[PDB]
Design a protein around this ligand. Structure first.
Ligand code: SRM
Ligand code: SF4
Ligand SMILES: [Cl-]
Ligand SMILES: [Cl-]
Ligand SMILES: [K+]
Length: 538
C-alpha cells in the first residue's frame, strides 16, 4: 500500500467533515447527497424546523428536499416509509445497552397512540426501540419530547455509528464479567456529542456497529460487530481486546477479526474515536456494497489498518492483544426468560417474551406500569426482541405472575417462541420481499403444535438479503424471496439457512434449501427439528 493511499480523504470545514475536492471522483450517489448538504445541519442548525412546514407533495418536487426526507433525516433517526407507508416515518433511538425507563416508555407510547392504525412500536435486533406513524409536521415537537425524557434519536441510521449493544444482564447478573452500561453509555454520548450531535463521526463511508461484551454468554454478538470490546486482563490490568470488521450484507458476511490490540478500560472512547477516524479518513466511497469497514481492513491488511488506528491514539500508543481474555469458552448460553435471582440479595429479574418484538401503545403502558409497580421503573430490551424487568423484590414475584398481561407477554412461552427473531418485513419496510412478523408467528405456532423439544432452537426470519434479522446466526434461518407454486404462480417464499452458532464457538450459517414456498415451510421445519435437533412428534 502506497503512502498516498494513507492521505486522509475528508477535512473539517465549518464544524462538519466533508470529502476533500480531489477525492470526490467516482463516489456513490449517497456521498453526493452528503456533499450537496451536510445532514447534521437538519439538527445542529435546526433545518428541521422549516423543512417540517413543507407539504410532502411539495418536498417530493425538488431533489434537495426529497433527499432531506429520504436520506438526510436518518441522521435524526427518521426513516421515510416511502413505498409502504407514504408520508410516515419510522423513528429509531440511541438506547445504549437496551436500557429504558417507564417514563420513556410512556412517552413513546403517547407518540404512537396519536397515529392510530398507522402507529405501533418494535424492539430491534440491536436491543433498541423503533416507533412508527410519525408525520413530518410533528417532528420538532417529538425531538423536544424525547430530549425532555432523556432520549436521543441522533445518528441511528445511514452512515453513522449504530446502537451500542451490551449485556442485557449488566449490573444484575451474578455471573457477569464486567457491567457494560458505563461503557455503552460513554460510547453513545461520544457518538451523539452528548445528544447535541457529533459531526466528527457522522460522515462515515457506511454504517458501523459497536458492542461491549460483559457476559460469558456473549449475548452481545461480538463476532458480527464492526468493533467489539472483549474483556481481558493484560499485565495485571483490566481492559478490552479488540475485534474489528464483523458485518452482514447481501453480498458478503464476515466475522470480526482480532485487531491484535488491547486497551485499558479508560481508553474505550479514545480507541473508538481512533478506529472511526481511520475509517472516516481512509474508507472507499464507491460501490455501496464495498464500503463497510472490513473492506478497508482487507485493502490495507489488518496490520496496515492497525497502524492507522495507532497513529490516532493519544500519545500514538496501542498495546498488542492480551493472550487470553476473560470470556470462558466453557459456557452454556443461559435462558433469560422467566424469573431469575439478581446478584443483589432479595431481588429478581423477569424476562418477558414479546412475540416478534411488536407492541401497541396500550401494551407499552402496561409494561411501564409493571416496571413501576414491581421493579425500579426500568425496562431492558434484548437483541431477541424481548424485555427484562429488573430490580423486583423477590417477595413480589407471586403477585407478578398473576398479572393478566403476562398471558400475552409470557415469562415462559413455548421453547420455539423463546428463540424466534423476525425483522420488520413488508408491513413497513420498502426493501422487504415478504411479510415476516405475522407469518413467522403463524408458522412457529403450527410447528410447535406438531413437535416437542428440549433444545432451545433459534429461528430467525428476515425479509430480504440485508439480513437485519441475522439469519446467518440462526439454528434455522428464513430469508425472504419470491418463488413459484406447483402451478407456476408467484408466491412468497424463504431460502432456508442452517449452521449458525452463537457464543464463543460462533459460526456463520449458509443456505441449505432455496426458494421454499412459505405455505410449504411447516412440514420442512417439523422434519428438520426431528431429524437435526432432537424434536419429538406429539
Ligand atoms: C429494525 C431492524 C430489524 C429489526 O426488525 O430489528 C432493521 C431494519 C432496517 N434495516 Fe437493518 N435493521 C436492524 C438491524 C440490522 C442488522 C443486525 C445487527 O445490527 O446486528 C444488520 C446486519 C448486521 C450488519 O449491518 O452488519 C442490518 C443490515 C442492514 C443493511 C445491510 C447493510 C450492508 O452493509 O449492506 C441495510 C441496507 C443498508 O444499510 O444499505 C439495512 C437497512 C434497514 C432499513 C433502515 C431499511 C429501510 O430504511 O427501509 C430497515 C428499516 C425497516 C423498518 O421500517 O423497520 N439493514 N440491519 C434493526 C434495527 C437495529 C437498530 O436498532 O439500530
Ligand atoms: S432484512 Fe430487509 S425486509 Fe427486513 S427490515 Fe432489513 S431491509 Fe427490511
Ligand atoms: Cl439506514
Ligand atoms: Cl421505502
Ligand atoms: K421476541
Amino acid at each position: 500500500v502506497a503512502a498516498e493511499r494513507l492521505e486522509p480523504r475528508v477535512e473539517e470545514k465549518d464544524g462538519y467533515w466533508i470529502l476533500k475536492e480531489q477525492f470526490r471522483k467516482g463516489i456513490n450517489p449517497q456521498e453526493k447527497v452528503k456533499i450537496e448538504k451536510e445532514p447534521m445541519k437538519l439538527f445542529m442548525e435546526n433545518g428541521i424546523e422549516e423543512l417540517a412546514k413543507i407539504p410532502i407533495e411539495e418536498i417530493d418536487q425538488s431533489k434537495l428536499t426529497k433527499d432531506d426526507i429520504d436520506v438526510r433525516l436518518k441522521w435524526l433517526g427518521l426513516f421515510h416509509r416511502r413505498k409502504n407507508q407514504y408520508g410516515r416515518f419510522m423513528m429509531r433511538l440511541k438506547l445504549p445497552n437496551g436500557v429504558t425507563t417507564s417514563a420513556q416508555t410512556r412517552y413513546l407510547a403517547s407518540v404512537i397512540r396519536k397515529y392510530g392504525k398507522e402507529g405501533c412500536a418494535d424492539i430491534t435486533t440491536r436491543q433498541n426501540w423503533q416507533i412508527r406513524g410519525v408525520v413530518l409536521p410533528d417532528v420538532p415537537e417529538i425531538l423536544k419530547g424525547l430530549a425532555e425524557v432523556g432520549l436521543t434519536s441522533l445518528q441511528s441510521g445511514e452512515d453513522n455509528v449504530r446502537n451500542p449493544v451490551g449485556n442485557p444482564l449488566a449490573g444484575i447478573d451474578p455471573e457477569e464479567i464486567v457491567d457494560t452500561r458505563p461503557y455503552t453509555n460513554l460510547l453513545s454520548q461520544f457518538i451523539t456529542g452528548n445528544s447535541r450531535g457529533n459531526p466528527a463521526v457522522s460522515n462515515l463511508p457506511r454504517k458501523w456497529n459497536p458492542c461491549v461484551v460483559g457476559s460469558h454468554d456473549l449475548y452481545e454478538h461480538p463476532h458480527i460487530n464492526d468493533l467489539a470490546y472483549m474483556p481481558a486482563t493484560k499485565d495485571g490490568r483490566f481492559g478490552f481486546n479488540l475485534l474489528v470488521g464483523g458485518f452482514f450484507s447481501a453480498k458478503r458476511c464476515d466475522e470480526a477479526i482480532p485487531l491484535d490490540a488491547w486497551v485499558p478500560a479508560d481508553d474505550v472512547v479514545p480507541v473508538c474515536r481512533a478506529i472511526l477516524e481511520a475509517f472516516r479518513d481512509l474508507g472507499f466511497r464507491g460501490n455501496r456494497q464495498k464500503c463497510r469497514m472490513m473492506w478497508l481492513i482487507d485493502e490495507l491488511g489488518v496490520e496496515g489498518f492497525r497502524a492507522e488506528v495507532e497513529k490516532r491514539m493519544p500519545q500514538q500508543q496501542l498495546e498488542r492483544a492480551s493472550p487470553e481474555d476473560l470470556v470462558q469458552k466453557q459456557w452454556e448460553r443461559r435462558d433469560y426468560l422467566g424469573v431469575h435471582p439478581q446478584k443483589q440479595e432479595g431481588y429478581s429479574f423477569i424476562g418477558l417474551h414479546i412475540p416478534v418484538g411488536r407492541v401497541q401503545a396500550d401494551d407499552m403502558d402496561e409494561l411501564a406500569r409493571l416496571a413501576d409497580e414491581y421493579g425500579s421503573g426500568e425496562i431492558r430490551l434484548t437483541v431477541e426482541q424481548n424485555i427484562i424487568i429488573p430490580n423486583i423484590e423477590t417477595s413480589k414475584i407471586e403477585a407478578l405472575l398473576k398479572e393478566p398481561v403476562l398471558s400475552t407477554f409470557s415469562p415462559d412461552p413455548p421453547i420455539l417462541m423463546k428463540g424466534l427473531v423476525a425483522c420488520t418485513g413488508n408491513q413497513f419496510c420498502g426493501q422487504a420481499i415478504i411479510e415476516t412478523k405475522a407469518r413467522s408467528l403463524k408458522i412457529t405456532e403450527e410447528v410447535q403444535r406438531q413437535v416437542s423439544l428440549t433444545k432451545p432452537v433459534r429461528m430467525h426470519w428476515t425479509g430480504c438479503p440485508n439480513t437485519c434479522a441475522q439469519v446467518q446466526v440462526a439454528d434455522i434461518g428464513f430469508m425472504g424471496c419470491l418463488t413459484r407454486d406447483k402451478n407456476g404462480k408467484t408466491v412468497e417464499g424463504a431460502d432456508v439457512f442452517l449452521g449458525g452458532r452463537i457464543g464463543s464457538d460462533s459460526h456463520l450459517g449458509e443456505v441449505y434449501k432455496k426458494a421454499v414456498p412459505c405455505d410449504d415451510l411447516v412440514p420442512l421445519v417439523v422434519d428438520l427439528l426431528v431429524n437435526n435437533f432432537g424434536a419429538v412428534p406429539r
